[PDB]
């Protein structure tokens, strides 16, 4: 589910566009998910794609990167970006990104580390042409991390691939 175990309504989300520079679209969660007193919040990063050859980069902070602040952080899907979440009617199901987008390139390496969330950053590259509109999701959840009576936040990435080319 989108909001998760957290009781946040959809109007009480914080939504944001990705930082789009030089055909690279970035979701950086590394300060936005720390334990706040108003927590848990939903922090939703929205990646809208209607252009060719966009590299999507998602930066999700690691457990023990800062001490005590990410001690119960989880990311879903564990095999991101190869596996993503899709929202079918009243459900979130894992699906294969190669199946949803034809021509998609996931580099095995990001910055000489593995292209998995356990190295903190995932990354993928969208093809020159897309004929089929697809919406898919990633979760970077810090809302079970508690420090000083403050709860962390639930991060959502929603990628919208519009048809292009």
């Amino acid at each position, epitope marked *: 589910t989108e909001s998760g175990d957290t009781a946040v309504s959809e109007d009480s989300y914080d939504k944001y566009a990705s*930082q789009n520079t030089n055909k690279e679209y970035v979701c950086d969660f590394t300060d936005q998910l720390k334990p706040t007193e108003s927590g848990p919040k939903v922090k939703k*990063c929205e990646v809208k794609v209607n252009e060719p050859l966009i590299k999507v980069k998602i930066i999700c902070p690691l457990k023990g990167s800062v001490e005590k602040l990410y001690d119960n952080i989880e990311y879903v899907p564990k095999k991101s970006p190869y596996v993503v979440l899709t929202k079918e009617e009243t459900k979130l199901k894992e699906k294969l990104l190669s199946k949803l987008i034809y021509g998609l390139l996931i580099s095995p390496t990001v910055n000489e580390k593995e292209n998995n969330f356990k190295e903190g950053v995932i990354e993928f590259t969208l093809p020159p042409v897309v004929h089929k509109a697809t919406v898919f999701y990633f979760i970077c959840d810090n809302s079970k991390t508690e420090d000083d009576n403050k709860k962390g936040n639930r991060g959502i990435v929603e990628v919208y691939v519009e048809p292009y080319g």
Partner: antibody
Amino acid sequence: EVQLVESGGGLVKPGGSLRLSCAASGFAFSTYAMSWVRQAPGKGLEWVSSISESSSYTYYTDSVKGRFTISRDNAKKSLFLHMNSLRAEDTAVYYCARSDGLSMIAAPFDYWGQGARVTVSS
Amino acid sequence: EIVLTQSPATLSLSPGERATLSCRTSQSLSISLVWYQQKPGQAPRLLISDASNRAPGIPARFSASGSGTDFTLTISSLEPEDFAVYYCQQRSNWPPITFGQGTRLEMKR
């Protein structure tokens, strides 16, 4: 080159309404985020409101939620703050400011207008 | 809401001296702060965005550093033009975007 010129400031009774404007020039206005930042007399800076380039994202500080609306027209190269239900705490110089974007790391306010004084008094 | 606490409230220095301005955040931050200058009667202008991301027209004597909860703006030798108010600002746990209250840089005599 880059210029931001506000207008619309002045005196209002409490409970009154006012519309501020910021006219832009010297840059492609429809590719930048725009913001309003206020400065009370004797006090520092307080972020009020931000709007993304094509108005898909608006953001407000909590004390002006419900009362203030930010908007923009990219054809007229204009930014607006409509302020209703004005209280004496809204007394400030209001700055329009340009930024590259409103991601989760928000871009710095690289260019500022000259300010418009709003005095809410009986 | 991240509260930023600028320290000291007033710094009293002579030109040519290194100025060290502190900004403390109420929560830890791993993304850098943004610093601004304000001369009296004037709009604020952007000074620095990262370690070295000075704005157009902002000279090299302004540098910025810090992480976690402790952040500093350094003016490596003051010019008479630098005696002004300085504001830090966080941009990464937001909304609300929040500023520090200001440090006034005063000339010592």
